[PDB]
Amino acid sequence: SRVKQVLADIAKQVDFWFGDANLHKDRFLREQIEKSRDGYVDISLLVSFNKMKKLTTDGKLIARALRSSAVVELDLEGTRIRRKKPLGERPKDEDERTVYVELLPKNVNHSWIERVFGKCGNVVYISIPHYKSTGDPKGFAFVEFETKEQAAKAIEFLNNP
RNA sequence: UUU
């Protein structure tokens, strides 16, 4: 079903925005959870994000998508989401798992990098840096992989065609 | 702002 997939895609993005890797990088969301201290950010906040906007504007639907989720739980009324497992120390191994890659224009987005790099391991985080002042792509990307073993399977593709 |  088309709904089946929309529901699967809300859950894959929210299981990301709260997922270890993204939480360690982006500060804004990390500011929201700490600046409440009870955990729990409103699903209101999530509807305001550009990647959520593309899927749904209804929050009750988001609550449905997160019933089955390893991370992120809801509490009494399907209005707020907390991590469900606490976030601690930022992993020092990060650098050994991340991979520098020089890309072809124009910015080629997350959808092209996930495609080519999924072939050698579960892609945890992608970073396409843009210059402050002018939102211009710096020509590169940073692809984090879970397992330093998957990381090498990509620097192997650095030598292959 | 994959806030």
Author numbering: 29 to 189
Tell me what the authors wrote about this structure, in their words:
LARP7 is the family member showing the highest sequence similarity to La, with the characteristic La module in the N-terminal third of the protein. However, while La binds all nascent transcripts synthesized by RNA polymerase III via their shared termination motif, UUUOH, LARP7 binds almost exclusively to the non-coding RNA 7SK. The 7SK-specific 5′ cap is mono-methylated at the gamma phosphate of the 5′ triphosphate by another component of the 7SKsnRNP, MePCE (also called BCDIN3 in Drosophila). Together, MePCE and LARP7 bind 7SK on both ends, thus forming a stable 7SKsnRNP core protecting the RNA from exonucleases. Following a short unfolded region containing positively charged amino acids (1–27), the La module comprises two structured domains, one containing the LAM (residues 28–111) and the second, an RNA-recognition motif (RRM1; residues 120–199) according to a global analysis of the LARP superfamily.
The crystal structure of the LARP7 N-terminal domain, described here, is the first 3D structure of the La module of a member of the LARP family different from La showing the linked domains of the La module in a complex with RNA. The structure was solved from a crystal obtained in a drop initially set up with the hairpin HP4 (300–332). Indeed, difference Fourier showed densities for only three and five nucleotides in monomers A and B, respectively. The triplet of uridines at the 3′-end of 7SK binds into the cleft between the LAM and RRM1 domains. It is constrained in a characteristic hooked conformation, allowing strict recognition of the penultimate uridine, with a contribution of the RRM1 revealing LARP7 specificity. As was observed in La protein, the penultimate U-2 (numbering as in La) is anchored at the bottom of the crevice, and U-1 (the 3′-terminal uridine) at the surface of the LAM domain. The uridine U-3 stacks on U-1, leading to a characteristic fishhook shape of the backbone. The base ring is sandwiched between Phe44 from LAM and His138 from RRM1, in a pocket closed by Tyr153 from RRM1. Interestingly, the present crystal structure of the human LARP7 shows RRM1 to be smaller than the standard fold, with a β-sheet of only three strands. There is no additional C-terminal helix (α3 in HsLa), but helix α2 is one turn longer than in La, and extends to the last visible residue, Asn188.
